[PDB]
């Protein structure tokens, strides 16, 4: 059993990859940079391992497959769809926008079915049940 | 441009005579360093790429630093290096000379902090080659000396300097090697000792030999080496891949 | 990797090992056998690029597809250079007893991956060298992009530095335990080296 | 019913060729004789990897063949691609036909890198009546994917043709020389068919095949080297090969071309030497005898002398059409000779069709 | 039943070779005689580390051997890889067969770095009838993994062959010279088989083996050094070895090659010297006598003179085929002599098969 990473931390890293890849850096050099700029070890550690698969010649989608607990099937398939169609840059931009919307939506239920769904049923009928 | 790189098949285009190209072929084999000078769009880069491409470079480690790709070479032992964000030309040359290049090609010297590394590479005894924007000898030398290489280091370690031109006669578009053997420096001087091997007469569109003798290009470690140069002198298919393929042999 | 039946690979001692530039890289022990080659051409429908390999190395790769290694890797007490090589080695042997319960002395590869001029210019380019007597010669050693990248980090790290897309060129020195040095130039990715990552070593 | 079918060169890759021989009457006598023949270069993309990728289009071509021919006949023998067939020897025990066919399938099973999913056919390298049950069985198996056969029957079905025999080229090319081979019954002969997709070697004692081997190298490789070294299109590099290499005025071009094709000449010579050495195992001590060439790739100028000196065997072009009567008023022997190598198979399964 | 089986060189690594001798009749007399032989380069990847990674393909090769041979026979003796077998001496006490086999297994148990998980066989270095129970037992054990044997029986089962003997090469190579060795009954002889995967030394008094030792070094190492020093493929480096090293025109190439192979020559000489010194323990005071060479790695030009001067022993090539009748009308003695070293084992377990 392994967990994913925080909504914040997926966000930062998907943004910064989308940014570097759309800059025309090589994918492996993009990977190196975000690992080397990371503050949490678990991120720098994974991203070295994702990069290690990319330097063996695997796609980014197949390299992220080593962390299925962090990048779900829907994420990889978006990457792999971008790689198959020659649009890796624009699907990473999409994924970065997705991850940003996901983190913002998380903070913002919780502040004051996942946790958001269970907490949102639970808040929507609490009062009317009291009543 | 239009490219895919011009070859020595360009004695078709009357630019350089076959004899001179053999002399350069020789020259490049024993690692005489050369700079191609010329005003803007006289053919510097093309000619350079032609001279490297025409040689068999399959047995030597060659080694190029450019601000962007322009150089195509049909050769295996070759490291191609391109300036990236925040790197000076000197970073790549400085770290490259570091390995073991038999031949170093600098796209064009424009920060002379790299120029300096280049002529340093010439004095260790590499075969260095590059391009420079200028139209004659005060043009270059001035241009080379103004970020701090001396003419003893450049002229003393630079072997040959070709000068390229565009000649127009109404609608012909002609690119010719207008002309230069750098002998060395002089103690107490004017410095740059230059022996002009070939000039180009535009009036007849001809390349003349102007006081060059066989005793000049002797510079050989010996008899057998010098003999090899002579044979290539007179003894030594348009595509680059095939041409390289046939200089290789 | 993909072949026809595993049985056919083992019988003919051949193994596909990649697909590049519309061609199937096929490692083959008997490249003079036109029957086997034409069988592979017909069964795959793919144009082949033949690479000769030692028979037992091909067989080994067929059966593996580097496992015993995939586990001995997760042993931090091995890579650690702070530990004397004399002892480190011992751990690798005893740890290898896990599979079959002996000590293997001298696993060539298991050691080869844990413990005058070399020119490594790009991806899928045969290495060149300068021999003490023969000078510039081509070599039977090539690495595709993944292997290149891995070498490249290996050499970089042993020399004490961290090459990356942020710092793509690297001019360090390896200290062989025998006090012997070597100058290493090195480049990751293709950002400065379009022909891919690359390294040179002046011993 | 007993029909005189027809013959196309369906796996020509460079060219779809077709031949009609039949019982020709002259002066109250009748013998097999050439009636027509036809040739059209194969449009690209119709065949990929030995399979018919564009059946309907190849149909259009074949029908062009038939109308060009001016032929009534709509039955055909044809051939599979050398790249589409596994040919190899097999040792078994002599028994009832059913037990041999099943046993044959069983032994082929491992030697076929596909499921069956395979069409299989054998013939015995020696006469079965000459040995008893349980002893001295030797069949050679021809094996093929359904998708290939089905592609071909597709093309044929649509040209309005009906197939009766789907033969293989390395042996169909021999039917023209089978009488002349049967003249020396103990001589070992090699037969090379250098095509555009493949080069076959079959080597025989008499007209008894001893073995066959198929080499990926062919004329396409020569054309492709010419194309590489002069960034030419395939067709123009092909013409440069043909007329470039053989004209009386070609004195300046065998340097430019030969230097282009020299690596292919070397690799072909090495692959043929290798095949010959891999055969040569019971007659330790002996040498070769004589050999013939077929296929248009053979027609490379001087290639016959090169193969002769390099393989240690006299390699000669041969005229297939000597096996059939040829009316000089409808065909002149000179050209007929000129396209004999391309057409060897094209009249091959053609004598198969009035068999 | 009493069959005359066949003989392949299954662990040739460089080459699968096969031999058929049998009772040949001439003028009402019958003796063992060569009937056929066959050789095909081992398809690579077929053998790795002395195991058949791949029964099925090797099968295809073996069947090529049999049809090339033109042989009826489907029974075979073969051999395991020198890298796949542990051969070593063992001292015990003479008793009942069962007690010896179990005792033998028990003593081998420590000397085998695998579980058993091992196929074991012994033979006695001296005649058991010459000693009483409890005294003077000496067997030598041959030991092997099941996975190897099972790989080999796989290959054999599929070629349609039936094995009766799985022998070992260091002793199978001797059966050709056993009579000639039995001529001097007190002479100490060495026999080197320099193969492509391994070099064996067995040293004897008469045709009584005294010991065997297997060295990882072989002809593969020479080829690999050539390949290293001229970044060549394995096959071309092999050809450069063969014809490069022995042609009359090779005057310029023994510098380029010999400088490449010199480290291997040194290391081979040192490993052979080492093995000989590790034997030489009871005859403190003595010298050697005479020795023979087998295996294609022996055929390195001048290697025999080098080993002769370097080891202090007359090392000579030998013709195995002298042990069998050879019809001059079917084989010429010159070549037969030429491939004698490669084929020594190939006719070795071959005299084992009409035993």
Swiss-Prot record, chain A:
It comes from the Bacteria. The chain crosses the membrane at residues 71-91, 112-124. It is found in: Cell inner membrane. Disruption phenotype: Deletion mutant show missing type IV cytoplasmic dome and disc but the cytoplasmic ring is still present. Homotetramer. Interacts with PilB. Essential inner membrane component of the type IV pilus (T4P) that plays a role in surface and host cell adhesion, colonization, biofilm maturation, virulence, and twitching, a form of surface-associated motility facilitated by cycles of extension, adhesion, and retraction of T4P fibers. Controls both pilus assembly and disassembly and plays an important role in PilB localization to the complex and ATPase activity. Belongs to the GSP F family. This is Type IV pilus assembly protein PilC. It comes from Myxococcus xanthus (strain DK1622). The gene is pilC. The chain holds residues 71 to 209 of 417 of the full protein.
UniProtKB/Swiss-Prot annotation, chain C:
It is found in: Cytoplasm. The gene is pilB. The lineage of its organism: Bacteria, Pseudomonadati, Myxococcota, Myxococcia, Myxococcales. Belongs to the GSP E family. The chain holds residues 74 to 283 of 566 of the full protein. Disruption phenotype: Deletion mutants show complete loss of T4P-dependent motility since they did not assemble T4P. PilB and PilT double mutant also lack T4P-dependent motility. It comes from Myxococcus xanthus (strain DK1622). Homohexamer. Interacts with PilC. Interacts with PilM. The ATP-binding site is essential for assembly of pili. ATPase component of the type IV pilus (T4P) that plays a role in surface and host cell adhesion, colonization, biofilm maturation, virulence, and twitching, a form of surface-associated motility facilitated by cycles of extension, adhesion, and retraction of T4P fibers. Acts as a molecular motor to provide the energy that is required for biogenesis of the pilus and the extrusion of substrates generated in the cytoplasm. PilB ATPase activity is also essential for T4P extension while antagonist PilT ATPase activity is required for T4P retraction. It comes from the Bacteria. This is Type IV pilus assembly ATPase PilB.
